[PDB]
Amino acid sequence: GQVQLVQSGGGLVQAGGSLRLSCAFSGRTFSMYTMGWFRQAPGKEREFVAANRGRGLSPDIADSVNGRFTISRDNAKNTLYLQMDSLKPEDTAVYYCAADLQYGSSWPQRSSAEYDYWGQGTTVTVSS
């Protein structure tokens, strides 16, 4: 399965504003992958943000962003999204999407080490 994840979106945003991140999947059967968002802030551990399953209806969303960040996938475009609302300075980070084949994966899966494929990352900088 030739798999690649290509991210789009991000950049500068004002505190209180909104951004939507994109993660385009190339390869066979998007729906057999658990897809996750992680972020890396300076001096902090890599943080799980949100994840969903190939055909799942109930995503897993970290407490630190619950009520502000939402996730979905568009199967026609084979693309995963992260909608980030009510952005705060502490949301500044490099954001990555990751994919894991659902044969043998855990659910939920908040450990980055268990994801096999990774996007190139996009930097989100929240200004005040």
Author numbering: 1 to 128
Task: Copy out sentences from the published article reporting this entry, exactly as the authors wrote them.
In this work, we describe the expression, purification, crystallization and structural analysis of the variable fragment of an antibody BCD090-M2, which demonstrated an affinity to the extracellular domain of ErbB3 in preliminary experiments. In conclusion, here were present expression and purification, functional and structural analysis of a new single-domain llama antibody against human ErbB3. The phage display selection of antibodies from immunized llamas and subsequent sequencing allowed the identification of several anti-ErbB3 single-chain antibodies. The surface plasmon resonance experiment confirmed that the recombinant VHH antibody was functional and efficiently bound to the immobilized receptor.
The protein was successfully crystallized in two different forms: in space group C2 with a single copy of BCD090-M2 in the asymmetric unit and in P1 with two molecules and two cadmium ions in the unit cell. The crystal structures of the VHH antibody in space groups C2 and P1 were solved by molecular replacement at 1.6 and 1.9 Å resolution. The high resolution of the dataset and good quality of the electron density maps allowed us to build a precise atomic model of the antibody. The CDR H1 and H2 belonged to two large common clusters, H1-13-1 and H2-10-2 respectively. The CDR H3 was not assigned to any known structure cluster, probably due to size (18 residues) and complex structure of the loop, which has a cis-proline and four aromatic residues. Surprisingly, the CDR H2 existed in multiple distant conformations in different crystal forms, while the more complex CDR H3 had a low structural variability. We crystallized the antibody in two different forms and solved high-resolution structures, giving an insight to the organization of the putative ErbB3 binding paratope.
